[PDB]
Design an enzyme around this catalytic site. Structure first.
Site, short mmCIF file in Angstrom:
data_model
loop_
_atom_site.label_atom_id
_atom_site.label_comp_id
_atom_site.label_asym_id
_atom_site.label_seq_id
_atom_site.Cartn_x
_atom_site.Cartn_y
_atom_site.Cartn_z
N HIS A 61 50.96 27.91 50.90
CA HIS A 61 51.08 28.84 49.78
C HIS A 61 49.75 29.19 49.16
O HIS A 61 49.64 30.24 48.50
CB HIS A 61 51.95 28.26 48.65
CG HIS A 61 53.27 27.76 49.11
ND1 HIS A 61 54.25 28.60 49.58
CD2 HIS A 61 53.77 26.50 49.19
CE1 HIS A 61 55.33 27.88 49.90
NE2 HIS A 61 55.05 26.61 49.69
N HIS A 91 43.42 25.30 42.65
CA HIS A 91 43.76 26.25 43.71
C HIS A 91 43.54 27.66 43.16
O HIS A 91 43.24 27.84 41.97
CB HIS A 91 45.22 26.07 44.15
CG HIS A 91 46.19 26.33 43.05
ND1 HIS A 91 46.62 25.35 42.19
CD2 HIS A 91 46.77 27.49 42.63
CE1 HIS A 91 47.42 25.89 41.28
NE2 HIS A 91 47.52 27.19 41.52
N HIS A 93 44.82 32.05 43.53
CA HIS A 93 45.72 33.14 43.97
C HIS A 93 44.82 34.34 44.20
O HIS A 93 43.88 34.55 43.42
CB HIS A 93 46.75 33.44 42.87
CG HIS A 93 47.53 32.25 42.46
ND1 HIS A 93 48.73 31.90 43.04
CD2 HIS A 93 47.24 31.25 41.59
CE1 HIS A 93 49.17 30.78 42.51
NE2 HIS A 93 48.29 30.35 41.62
N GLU A 103 47.16 36.46 38.63
CA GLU A 103 48.51 36.26 38.11
C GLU A 103 48.59 36.77 36.68
O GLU A 103 49.37 37.67 36.36
CB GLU A 103 48.93 34.81 38.28
CG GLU A 103 49.08 34.45 39.75
CD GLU A 103 49.94 33.28 40.02
OE1 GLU A 103 49.81 32.25 39.32
OE2 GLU A 103 50.78 33.37 40.94
N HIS A 116 43.22 28.26 39.15
CA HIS A 116 44.01 27.38 38.30
C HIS A 116 43.53 25.95 38.46
O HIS A 116 43.65 25.38 39.54
CB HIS A 116 45.49 27.46 38.70
CG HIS A 116 46.10 28.76 38.32
ND1 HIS A 116 47.27 29.24 38.87
CD2 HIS A 116 45.65 29.70 37.45
CE1 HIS A 116 47.53 30.43 38.33
NE2 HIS A 116 46.55 30.73 37.47
N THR A 195 53.64 28.69 37.99
CA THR A 195 53.85 30.02 38.54
C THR A 195 54.40 29.98 39.96
O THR A 195 54.60 31.04 40.56
CB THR A 195 52.59 30.89 38.50
OG1 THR A 195 51.64 30.41 39.47
CG2 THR A 195 51.97 30.95 37.13
N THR A 196 54.65 28.80 40.50
CA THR A 196 55.31 28.61 41.77
C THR A 196 56.55 27.76 41.55
O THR A 196 56.59 26.93 40.64
CB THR A 196 54.39 27.89 42.78
OG1 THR A 196 53.79 26.73 42.16
CG2 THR A 196 53.31 28.85 43.23
ZN LIG Z 1 48.40 28.67 40.46
#
Ligand SMILES: [Zn+2]
Length: 257
Positions: A61, A91, A93, A103, A116, A195-196
């Site tokens: 992911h 991590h 995005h 995000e 993040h 957010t996941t």
């Molecule tokens: Zn994140």
């Protein structure tokens, strides 16, 4: 399994995780006219001097850099927080083009990527216990824009070719996450969620106003990663961001006007 595609992406997540339609979901759009400057908001305290990175992993992911959270020092505190939170991983995005990938958004503007840094509250023993609490996590969100290279990111970008597919990992000791921070720690803050999936409503979000600059060369490397495992058909890891969710009367507070 959930993902970011047409048939398993954010619009589908509510079927397995009904909290996806809950009252404190993340990310959100930060409307700078409706956010409230709060002069009582203290400076953030980010103390990463003793941080001990361990490994970098492609989990299918994103990619995560994991830290030894067995001791203090690597701690987020201050700002809007009433406790101390230990760094466990970071991590990113990112998008399929420089014009999207973050995000959170600011007045609807999307950045090329978002970092993040995930920390858990020392009241609760460990990460897995903390996520069951409304104040379990503090996540520092940092926008990435394209410009000059970020030297402290280079080790990360350089290793990504070794972790192309899901389930791959590499040794990743001696990495200093201080090299990922912008100069200013001015921030917005609001209560929200992972957010996941599982989308738990356990996060105090602290989103820095100042983006870090990374080069086009650096961000292009993110887009070579794969969602798939080795030997499976290629599914490029791009657009692994959840869009902004309804604020639902939460108040976003700012440490500045
Ligand atoms: Zn994140």
């Amino acid at each position: 399994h959930w993902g970011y595609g047409k048939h398993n992406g954010p619009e589908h997540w509510h079927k397995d995780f009904p909290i996806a339609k809950g009252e404190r979901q993340s990310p959100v759009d930060i409307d700078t006219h409706t956010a409230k400057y709060d002069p009582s908001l203290k400076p953030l305290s980010v103390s990463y001097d003793q941080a001990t990175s361990l490994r970098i992993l492609n989990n299918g992911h994103a990619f995560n850099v994991e830290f030894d959270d067995s001791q203090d020092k690597a701690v987020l505190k201050g700002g809007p927080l009433d406790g101390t939170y230990r760094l466990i991983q970071f991590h990113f995005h990112w998008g399929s083009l420089d014009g999207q990938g973050s995000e959170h958004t600011v007045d609807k503007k999307k950045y090329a990527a978002e970092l993040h840094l995930v920390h858990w509250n020392t009241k609760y023993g460990d990460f897995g216990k903390a996520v069951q609490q409304p104040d379990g996590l503090a996540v520092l969100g940092i926008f990435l824009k394209v410009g000059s290279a970020k030297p402290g990111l280079q080790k990360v970008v350089d290793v990504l070719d070794s972790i192309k597919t899901k389930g791959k990992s590499a040794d990743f000791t001696n990495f200093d996450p201080r090299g990922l921070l912008p100069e200013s720690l001015d921030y917005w803050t609001y209560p929200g969620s992972l957010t996941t999936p599982p989308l738990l409503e356990c996060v105090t979000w602290i989103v820095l106003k100042e983006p870090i600059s990374v080069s086009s060369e650096q961000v292009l490397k993110f887009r070579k990663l794969n969602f798939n495992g080795e030997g499976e058909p290629e599914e490029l890891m791009v657009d692994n961001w959840r869009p902004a969710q309804p604020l639902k009367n939460r108040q976003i507070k700012a440490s500045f006007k």
